[PDB]
């Protein structure tokens, strides 16, 4: 049965006027800025920008991929497709 999310996780994360896209649950690094209750820090390949989103925007990897994980003419998300695949928990920094 499910878990709560956790860092690492890996998504395809909706945000409005965008098609569900690559990302993790990151990490909160030492010292840097929290996201607002309930929400979770989410990292998006590809572009390796960052919003903070509630589970409802937060669909499983594996589960979705599938539906979701088809390429896409918007910047950065086939770029996107290939971390999430190839190399999840790498430093994009």
């Known amino acids: 049965m499910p878990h709560a999310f956790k860092p690492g996780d890996l998504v395809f994360a909706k945000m409005k006027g965008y098609p569900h896209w690559p990302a993790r649950i990151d990490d909160i ?3 840097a800025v929290k ?3 309930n929400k979770y820090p989410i990292f ?3 572009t390796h920008e960052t919003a903070f989103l509630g589970p409802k925007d937060l669909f499983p990897y594996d589960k979705s ?3 979701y994980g088809k390429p896409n ?4 998300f086939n770029e996107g497709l290939w971390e999430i695949q190839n190399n ?3 430093s994009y920094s």
């Open 35 to 37: 996201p607002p209750p």
């Open 65 to 67: 991929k599938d539906k």
């Open 29 to 31: 690094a030492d010292g």
């Open 44 to 46: 998006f390949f590809g």
């Open 73 to 76: 003419k918007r910047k950065g």
């Open 88 to 90: 999840p928990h790498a």
